């Protein structure tokens, strides 16, 4: 027994009406079922289904059932509200200017702690939104270096949802000063990572009430948010990475370590996309050429992408041939050093989707955060 119910919301394509249903999931047996709250008769009867997971049962995370895409909007129940929403709390974090070249181990520590990452996007904020971060802070110390790092160095804002997220973030972070943390010498995100104490770190809110103020300071409603945090071109604007489903698998930290290996930079990450139109807009070159196009748009339909602009660094190995052949088994035939043999999880729908022709990288990047 012990079903969990939700209210679902699907956009009907032919007659363009937004449709509200009630989905039911049955943990411990794998069943789903769907009635309609709008009209009380049953259209979808009960079925078993294997791909849905209890970690995918979170409000907001958009999950496909039987080739239909829906976002779980409400809590229709007090039982599941008590069972999940009392524990699932959100915490705010931010990659500062120093942590871009060391983010892989910190993200692996976050994935070992088990927080679900909702939105982790690079941002360059405006004047008022930049000053609203430093409006709250006031004390004896001189924070000129930290203020110049915030106003100059690029940053990323991220949201992590977890059971007692503030408590687990505090216990993972530990002491505040870098020298004090190193003198305490426990394994911590502040002890191992971060530069010069208050100069740069991964941001952590003091209290659950102050987390709202910190989140509103760093990432407010998108009026003056700032669409870009990186240069549009550097004469090699030709590498696009995207992670639609391997972020849900959790290997984002490990692939950040393997791309930090062999001396490759990472420029800009963000996590906003519409499932179809935005991807269609830039899979346009891919539209005539590629086969299994349905699958290659379905595993971008599946989830959000931490999609990332990257430049060519060395000419000794091309980034496309580091990314590897289009098939993971062909990669495992040829060389284990290919990123599909290390990480690729589908037959053609690789773990890192790139561009093939080197010309269109600049236009795809300008679309992906300059336009969007």
């Amino acid at each position: 027994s012990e079903r969990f119910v939700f209210i679902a919301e699907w956009f009907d394509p032919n007659a363009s009406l937004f449709r509200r249903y009630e989905l039911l999931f049955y943990p411990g047996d794998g069943s789903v079922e769907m009635h309609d709250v709008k009209n009380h008769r049953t259209f979808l009867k009960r079925t078993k289904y294997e791909d849905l997971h209890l970690e995918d049962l979170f409000i907001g995370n958009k999950v496909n059932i039987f080739s239909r895409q829906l976002v779980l909007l409400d809590y229709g129940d007090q039982y599941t509200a008590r069972q999940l929403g009392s524990k699932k709390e959100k915490t705010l974090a931010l990659i500062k200017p120093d942590a871009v070249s060391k983010a892989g181990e910190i993200i692996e520590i976050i994935n070992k702690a088990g927080f679900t990452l909702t939105k982790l996007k690079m941002m360059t904020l405006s004047r008022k939104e930049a000053t609203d971060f430093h409006i709250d802070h006031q004390s004896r110390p001189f924070l000129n270096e930290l203020i110049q790092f915030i106003t100059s160095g690029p940053i990323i804002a991220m949201e992590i949802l977890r059971d007692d997220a503030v408590c687990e973030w505090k216990r993972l972070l530990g002491p505040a000063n870098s020298g004090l943390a190193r003198t305490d010498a426990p394994e911590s995100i502040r002890a191992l990572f971060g530069t010069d104490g208050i100069k740069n770190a991964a941001h952590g809110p003091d209290s659950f009430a102050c987390a709202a103020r910190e989140m509103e300071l760093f990432f407010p409603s998108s009026g003056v948010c700032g669409p870009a945090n990186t240069a549009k071109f550097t004469n090699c604007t030709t590498c696009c990475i995207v992670k639609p489903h391997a972020v849900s698998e959790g290997l984002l930290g490990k692939i950040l370590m393997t791309i930090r290996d062999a001396g490759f930079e990472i420029s800009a990450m963000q996590m906003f996309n519409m499932d179809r139109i935005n991807v269609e807009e830039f899979y346009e070159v891919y539209k005539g050429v590629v086969s299994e196009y349905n699958e290659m748009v379905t595993e971008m339909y599946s989830g959000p992408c931490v999609a990332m602009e990257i430049q060519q660094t060395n000419p000794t190995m091309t980034f496309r041939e580091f990314c590897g052949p289009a098939d993971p088994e062909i990669a495992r035939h040829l060389r284990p050093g290919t990123l599909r043999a290390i990480f690729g999880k589908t037959k053609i729908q690789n773990a890192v989707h790139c561009t093939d022709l080197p010309e269109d990288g600049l236009l795809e990047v300008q679309y992906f955060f300059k336009i969007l």
Partner: protein, 427 residues
């Protein structure tokens, strides 16, 4: 052009015939939401056979969903592909499906037959050339063997030239879960051997015993037999929607198969069935499937071959094979069995090789027998009727609902014409 109109009556065929619409829609690539979801391009240009289109270019099926009680139309609107049907031509009813032939025809069937013909017309009068009627019925009750007769005897007055190929489950040789059976079934064989032009047969008993011997399953549910029947009917209707090298429509099967007008009940099959553990220890050729076609223990019928000299075996191959390997191995099985094929037909067999394999296996096929061993299924149900009639054992309800005594003699007398007119050409 080429098309087949469909209906789904009875409980037994409603579950199987809606298990049809997934084995179709995954081969051709339609999502449950009606959008095209195919990998290849070749299986879109013959979609006008089973499917009518919808505005925006999405795809709906040709089917009619009618049975007496609304219990099972809430079971075929179900999880996999319920959204695709038209909600207007869904038909329900009020009165019970109480297994009576007057509940099949005279009492409940009268009010629907005005409405449930106008679901054939609204999907047929908007067409060009009609070629087949596919109706998924049974032979047990007044639910499926009083509506399977009703929805085809009305039609033959107006659509007389074309071919009407249903698919029906015959009673099992051990235990049937209906006790009232041969008042209706023998009253429905009076029209099915008359009006229809081909009419299939399926045992329930043999459907279980494939799963224990060859599949080596532990637990065969009722979800398994659906798949085993739905694959056979979706392989014999493929030279009408695929490219191929030796291609036959449903009216080729009118002149190929039946020599004397009233002998058209065929025996289904499907060749490359195997288990899980024995896959690596099995090889796939055209000779290695051909044994499994002509396996005595791969048919859907319990009748042993020793009573049967096959009239017209038609094994429709589907794959990438050789046309000589087909022709040499559909004859090398025949000289080895002289006494089990008729001497008054010189070529007893017929093939058809196509170009598109099933989803999953590189090559498969579909045996279709036509045997002289099917008198054993004839001798069973005609023998159940004789003791139950002299008691008038359950005749109180049918007489109460309105079926006279002098017609139950006549139905068994004409069911006796399906062995007597069979026995002339047995020898």
């Amino acid at each position: 052009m080429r098309e087949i109109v469909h209906l789904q009556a009875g409980q037994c065929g409603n579950q199987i015939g809606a298990k049809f619409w997934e084995v179709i829609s995954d081969e051709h690539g339609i999502d449950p939401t009606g959008t095209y979801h195919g990998d290849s391009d070749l299986q879109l240009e013959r979609i006008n056979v089973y499917y009518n289109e919808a505005t925006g270019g999405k795809y709906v099926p040709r089917a009619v969903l009618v049975d007496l009680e609304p219990g099972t139309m809430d079971s075929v609107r179900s999880g996999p592909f319920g959204q695709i049907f038209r909600p207007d031509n869904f038909v329900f009813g009020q009165s019970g499906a109480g297994n009576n032939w007057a509940k099949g025809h005279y009492t409940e069937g009268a009010e629907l037959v005005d409405s449930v013909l106008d679901v054939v017309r609204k999907e047929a009068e908007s067409c060009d050339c009609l070629q087949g009627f596919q109706l998924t019925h049974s032979l047990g009750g007044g639910t499926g063997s009083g509506m399977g007769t009703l929805l085809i005897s009305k039609i033959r007055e107006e659509y007389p030239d074309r071919i009407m190929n249903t698919f029906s489950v015959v009673p099992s040789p051990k235990v049937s879960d209906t006790v009232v059976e041969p008042y209706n079934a023998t009253l429905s064989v009076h029209q099915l051997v008359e009006n229809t032009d081909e009419t299939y047969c399926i045992d329930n008993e043999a459907l279980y015993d494939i799963c224990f011997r060859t599949l080596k399953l532990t637990t065969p549910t009722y979800g398994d037999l659906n798949h085993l029947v739905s694959a056979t009917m979706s392989g014999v209707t493929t030279c009408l929607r695929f490219p191929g090298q030796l291609n036959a429509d449903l009216r080729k099967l009118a002149v190929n198969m039946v020599p004397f007008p009233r002998l058209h009940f065929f025996m289904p099959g499907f060749a490359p069935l195997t288990s899980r553990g024995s896959q690596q220890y099995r090889a796939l050729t055209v000779p290695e499937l051909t044994q499994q076609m002509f396996d005595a223990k791969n048919m859907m019928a319990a009748c042993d071959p020793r009573h049967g000299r096959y009239l017209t075996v038609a094994a429709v191959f589907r794959g990438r094979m050789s046309m000589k390997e087909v022709d040499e191995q559909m004859l090398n099985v025949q000289n080895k069995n002289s006494s089990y094929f008729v001497e008054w037909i010189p070529n007893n067999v017929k093939t058809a090789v196509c170009d598109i394999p099933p989803r999953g296996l590189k090559m498969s096929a579909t045996f279709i027998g036509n045997s002289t061993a099917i008198q054993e299924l004839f001798k069973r149900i005609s023998e159940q009727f004789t003791a139950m009639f002299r008691r008038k054992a359950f005749l109180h309800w049918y007489t109460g609902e309105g079926m006279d005594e002098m017609e139950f003699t006549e139905a068994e007398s004409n069911m006796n014409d399906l062995v007597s007119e069979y026995q002339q050409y047995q020898d």
